[PDB]
Ligand binder design. Structure first.
Ligand SMILES: Nc1ncnc2c1ncn2[C@@H]1O[C@H](COP(=O)(O)OP(=O)(O)O)[C@@H](O)[C@H]1O
Ligand SMILES: Nc1ncnc2c1ncn2[C@@H]1O[C@H](COP(=O)(O)OP(=O)(O)O)[C@@H](O)[C@H]1O
Ligand SMILES: Nc1ncnc2c1ncn2[C@@H]1O[C@H](COP(=O)(O)OP(=O)(O)O)[C@@H](O)[C@H]1O
Ligand SMILES: Nc1ncnc2c1ncn2[C@@H]1O[C@H](COP(=O)(O)OP(=O)(O)O)[C@@H](O)[C@H]1O
Ligand SMILES: [Mg+2]
Ligand SMILES: [Mg+2]
Ligand SMILES: [Mg+2]
Ligand SMILES: [Mg+2]
Lengths: 477, 477, 477, 477
């Protein structure tokens, strides 16, 4: 009774982002209380912006937060599978199956799914840039752009492959994301170093400094003669002032051949302190030759529509930065979420070396094998394993729904292609309407995406099914 | 629309006799317009006594008439499977599957069922009286009596085995059914020959005649001296007059040592003409010594409550007669329908030599194998093949329902016993509640029972699905 | 207003037989006031059996009566197109198009359809038995039997080809249809001559007569010696008496070696007078040696279930008779309607020598060409020509509907195959689900089928659109 | 469901300005919350003044803002086509066509429309003043004045042709728009230079100065003797003070033969700095002989109702200014929007050299060619391309509706005139009621008008169709 409304609340959250799955997915319209409009195909964006107050709905959201924290992609996939599991479980409750039996079936079916996924996955090499590019292609194109990814995917593959340490681990904090308005999306490029979105405050100043000694000054300049003497004595050639710089000081800086920029953002003072290794000085007497950062090259090179300072050839950091360019602000914010997703799947591929074919092909193969495993189960426990397998068909059907095809006959032909030692990679290519080999089409995604999503969907539904009543408590906590 | 109510009418006829399946089946109460009450477990009895006016209902009844004409048992099974097919097909219509696709699926699944049944069936020898007894045991005990069949089954096995010609064919008209009230049911016995429920019209007449010359007279006797001269000249010792015999003629018949009975029924004049080989004479001049029948013994022996004429030791006919004894009239009529059913299954076993294990095991094994065949089908045609396999589960579930068990978990454990090269004969034994090997329990039925019923259920449902509207015609015919 | 209900009444008659189109057509159930049931796929049977009282409905039925009288097939096609024309016309009335403009458009579009059909049709030779077999195959298989036609079609092709006179005309009365119950449908055969469903009244009579002299006697026999003298003097060896024959006359007829049959039907006296060329004598003195018919062989040969007199090897008549065999009465009556249809289309093919590809391919090709012709029309008259073209798509759509496919995308792919100098014979093969060349599949039908159906559909709808009110008259006639 | 109301909101915005299309367009009445009344035929004026709160309505308005920013004309055409696309798409949704299929059809049909437009357009010479006059005639006369354009169009053609640089590009900021109340509309004239709506502060001052040295003074005058010495030493003859001028300074300025005006607007200080090339001095010591601007003539000539300073014969700027005259304020504001529109179409003509015939002729020709392209499409994707072609007919129909004619037969005769390679420029001349060659009537518009409008209408509808639900978000942004 009161238990069912929890199942209802969970399915409501699922069907909210249901139609946003896959490249041909539908866009949702987000409207706040102030009348601002947001249109997006990304599932996790919709999940965080929703006005979610129901507890069972929040218990489901923690799957997407967990799925994105541990993988970065598949949050839409995990939520939809959880919703379909709740629907199939409600059907079994309507057949007088006790909830604990459904949980025992789901729990046993989730473990068997993990073992089967470990055998379906194909092994790849952490140096195969082609397979890594196909992984990024599949992960980004689910949002809604074609062939522009081919340039961005190779940029992301080169960025991640550079920050891979000698242990095969990928630290996403080593790849800084930088967002700036520009002329077009294609202007997005990768830079071996760090970026400063400023220009020389005086054109007479020298524009390039090699073997730079970076100085981070947090005090305004606008007494002053002794300040210039102390800074010049520290043996520095590059100065970054967070506040302003005196116009008379900008002259003596240009005469001494010293590049300097004022109005430097607080974020640039933080990244220079973290990367190059400088302190944020609070008193000019503290500035020394050791607080300076080291950099092989500091060059301000213009770009399409803007001029900014590039700090390249820094051997000490071993890190890179993504310069994201775009026309509008919402386009840039959409491109940023595409990079965060591709970084996750490429990172998971290098760490795990296990991938499966996408397009719902792996789901169908897993569904068929689980129905075989269900046959051998005695006791009511079997019916839950059946539903768990038939629940996985929600992923290929939703893809066919959003592709405009008849999900019934599409799901039929794919099941036929997998039947009796078929092609475990046969799926629906939403661009052609035919059933093809997803591996030959370059549609692949990491194994951790599927394993983490399925386990996350199972554990949440198991948690909801153990709830049979909600009780009005007082105070607590 | 108007099509669906036809499907509804069929399921109504199905669910009417649904709970009458199996030995533990439920009894139905038949009440006419005059207030007479009839309680029975036999399905075909209920089907003919129903006030059936709907055309789709009549189209369903013709399956039971065909099933009983071609087999004699399994009419309940064919009707129930037809109803479950109608229910599963209605589900597919509710999923926007066109009727012709369902027909194509059912039609292709019915043919695959015939091929699979031909491989599940076990071969037996036409002389194995033990297996023939187990066949009769299974067919009769479905009505509602225990271990009394063991005596009757061996009587039926000996009766059928005697009339088997040199071509393995069984003519049910060679086994005459005779019903007479008596002391108990156990008094039912088999007689090697034919019976005449008459007595000597004169006690002074000789009661026994050996090497009898049977005479069939169709003319009343009550000129007359020339009639006695012609009949005595024909060289006959036994006379059967359909009409009466003169009292003065009854005297000269008793004096000459000639046994004679008057008021002989028309059925006895037919069976004597068919068995012993005599003509029905219409003019006394046609009576000759060749129109006489031959019989080794003609003896009138009294029985409990009656005296009648037995004609035994007739090597020429090669036919026998069943003497049915019972307490009441309704009990005898129930025993007669048990014999007509057992005669059919024993006859089908000797002619075909193919039997299958009961208990729903053949249905479950066929259902499981058909779900495997459905996997390889592309196009919407697959979904009908799925439903056709899952429709067969109505037979084991109804047995479990009528046995008082939980049909869900019973059907689960049986499917587990058949899964992955299991025991094709594993079913639910309604007397113990456990799943056992039906072959080891002696629960077997002929192959023609299953093949004819399944094909009959498919063809009727196929015929109903091609109907999409009923039109108000005028006159016609 | 009152005009529209006429359009409604016509569409009701159309959609009544709509789903009966094509081989995969649906079956309708006809129920009279007495409860008798008739299930059929044939459209014209349903049209005559309907309880039709509405005048506009009767005005539509006369199209099927006209289509069947002048062609024999396509009555369902003409009715459905007429109904679709009425629907498209109702749309134009709802756009404030005057009925006479719709008529002017329909009338101008119907004539242009005749011009295009004359150029789409392919020419065949009146001696090409292969193409004639494909014509009969296509026309019969629309009812619901497979490959049994291949034997029956060649029988029908040989029957029609024999009665073709030296002017290419086919008289359907020269091919007698004979219906008799038998063992199976395959026993249907063609006989080179005429048939008499009688047997020799005396088995002692000689059973065979060669070089027969047929005599037609209309006077009862049962004076008599002078009658035998006059008949024997006329020089006849075969006598057909419509009334009875004296038993003593049956003796003297059998002694003279003269075959004779009594109780001969009136239909047999008519066909013998028409074929062999004999007179129906009304006075024994009129019987002469010249009133006799000539026949090479008269033989009474038994068949499965009956014995009858065959009159073969008659060179003079030039006519044949179809012996229809079947299991039940309704099956035979269904086979008879198939022959009458095939005779019509084969006759239309030999007379015209023009055929078009079936399957709806010709309809789509005609529809596409009419939309091109519609473009060049000025004034509101154009809109009707558009509707006339888009109305023809009802035939391929109904075939796709009855085949279980999605009529939308099937109709799309066919239009694509015909577009920009495509294949004018590309249609939907309901047996495979793919679009194929209908000529290569052997699916063809005579040009007169299409031309007469389209003109019949147009003229009736033209007649309905000129009706704008119904007036309550008195007496009249 | 919730998606459909978005389609509804867009069509509401479309039909709001629907009847304002073409010269015979209808006037709309705008009433604010204060009771002020505005009557206009201009579509873009109505679109910005509407109380638009619905998001889907705003998403549609952004098309008119985009169309006006990139072209300047066709905003009404793009909105109406967008609305008609939404209506035709709703019909396809009511036929169970998935939105992504409609988008795929629209997207593919929009690209084919761009390619077809590139071949329909005729090339013109950037020096052909006659064709440029016909372009301005067609663009302005859509608002509501006759033959007054012939004088204004030639004025606009001369203004744009003067500011065309050596690269064929037209910078609209080089043509300054000046609005002033006057005696009549015909007093609108073009001035080769820049305008200053000021008069001499002293009538005793000389009114004309040749070889002027423009001085821009930003400091108030009202020490003062040294200020006059520094300005006179700089060698200047014309002074523009943004603030006031001392009355005693106004005396010494009049004695030296120096023209001076005080209270000069900030816009005049900006335009003089941009055109003549002068600096805005902030300290009298910075004024030099090089900060002065150069001008061949500075003359204050009175006009009907006012006197102002004209700065003509300035070879250096290469820019001109439009003096707009009118009776009332609202009349002047309407004339200004006419010039901005004509400047856009004349500019697009010189840059592109591609024009198409107006009157809906290009729309009909594009509609007919797209229906030919639609024929060859397989799969449901075709149906959207059909609707896209039939959607373009909204433009000729709306013109015929506003012209008072029967849109049905007018659209018919135009389609007939275009059918099978008709006159691709045949359209409806709303002044005569007949179908004529629009090129021979001087009804032409640039290619960029159609290409940008069609693409803008398609992309917006594509964006609306990807929306399937609106979600209640919290906070965001
Ligand atoms: N080219 C493609 N063909 C078929 N399926 C695809 C393709 N690209 C992506 N997908 C599917 O889209 C799904 C993910 O899409 P999306 O919802 O955008 O991201 P998320 O992984 O967060 O759910 C994956 O399961 C994948 O199978
Ligand atoms: N001892 C038993 N255990 C399990 N099933 C049985 C047993 N005896 C009979 N059956 C089942 O009963 C079914 C037939 O029973 P019943 O309805 O009485 O006759 P009918 O064949 O006319 O329907 C068979 O399909 C068989 O599988
Ligand atoms: N093998 C076939 N494949 C496709 N269409 C067929 C085939 N055979 C017959 N048809 C179609 O069936 C239609 C006629 O069927 P039916 O309604 O039974 O007879 P009628 O010609 O009286 O309407 C024809 O228009 C023909 O195109
Ligand atoms: N003289 C004319 N004859 C026929 N049509 C015209 C004429 N002048 C303009 N039009 C039509 O009017 C349409 C534009 O009118 P309007 O709505 O006033 O401006 P906008 O271009 O902003 O929509 C063009 O599509 C053009 O075809
Ligand atoms: Mg993704
Ligand atoms: Mg039974
Ligand atoms: Mg036909
Ligand atoms: Mg305009």
């Amino acid at each position: 009774d009161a238990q069912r409304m929890n199942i209802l609340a969970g399915r409501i959250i699922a069907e909210t982002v249901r139609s946003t799955l896959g490249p041909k997915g539908m866009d949702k319209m987000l409207v706040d209380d102030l009348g601002d409009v947001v249109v997006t195909n990304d599932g996790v964006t919709i999940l965080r912006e929703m006005s979610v107050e129901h507890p069972a709905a929040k218990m489901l959201i923690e799957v997407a937060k967990t799925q994105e924290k541990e993988v970065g992609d598949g949050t839409t996939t995990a939520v939809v599978v959880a919703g379909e599991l709740l629907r199939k479980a409600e059907e079994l409750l309507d057949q007088n199956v006790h909830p604990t039996i459904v949980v025992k079936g789901y729990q046993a079916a989730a473990q068997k799914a993990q073992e089967l996924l470990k055998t379906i996955a194909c092994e790849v090499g952490a140096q195969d840039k082609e397979i890594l590019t196909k992984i990024a292609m599949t992960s980004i194109t689910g949002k809604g752009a074609e062939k522009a990814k081919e340039k961005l995917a190779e940029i992301i593959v080169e960025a991640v492959s550079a920050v891979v340490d000698d242990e095969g681990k990928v630290d996403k904090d080593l790849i800084k994301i930088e967002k700036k308005s520009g002329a077009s999306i294609d202007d997005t490029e990768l830079i071996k170093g760090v970026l400063v979105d400023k220009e020389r405050v005086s054109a007479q100043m020298p524009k390039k400094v090699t073997d730079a000694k970076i100085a981070l000054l947090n005090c305004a300049i606008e007494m002053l003669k002794d300040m210039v003497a102390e800074i010049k004595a520290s043996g520095a050639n590059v100065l970054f002032c967070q506040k302003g710089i005196d116009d008379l000081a900008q002259h003596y800086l240009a005469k001494e051949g010293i590049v300097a920029a004022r109005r430097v953002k607080k974020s640039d003072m933080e990244k220079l302190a973290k990367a190059t290794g400088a302190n944020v000085i609070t008193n000019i007497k503290d500035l020394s030759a050791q607080d300076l950062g080291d950099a092989g090259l500091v060059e301000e090179r213009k770009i399409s529509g803007d001029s900014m300072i590039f700090v390249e050839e820094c051997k000490h950091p071993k890190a890179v930065t993504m310069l994201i360019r775009g026309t509008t602000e919402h386009v840039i914010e959409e491109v940023a979420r595409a990079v965060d997703a591709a970084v996750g799947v490429v990172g998971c591929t290098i760490e795990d070396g296990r991938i499966v074919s996408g397009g719902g092909s792996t789901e169908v193969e897993l569904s068929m094998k689980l129905r075989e495993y269900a046959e051998g189960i005695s006791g009511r426990e079997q019916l839950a394993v059946r539903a768990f397998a038939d629940a996985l068909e929600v992923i290929p059907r939703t893809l066919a729904e959003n592709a405009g095809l008849d999900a019934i006959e599409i799901l039929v032909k794919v099941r036929a292609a997998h039947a009796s030692n078929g092609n475990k990679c046969a799926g629906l290519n939403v661009f052609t309407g035919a059933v093809e080999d997803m591996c030959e089409n370059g549609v692949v995604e990491p194994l951790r995406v599927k394993t983490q999503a399925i386990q996350s969907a199972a554990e949440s539904t198991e948690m909801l099914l153990r709830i049979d009543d909600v009780i009005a408590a007082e105070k607590l906590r």
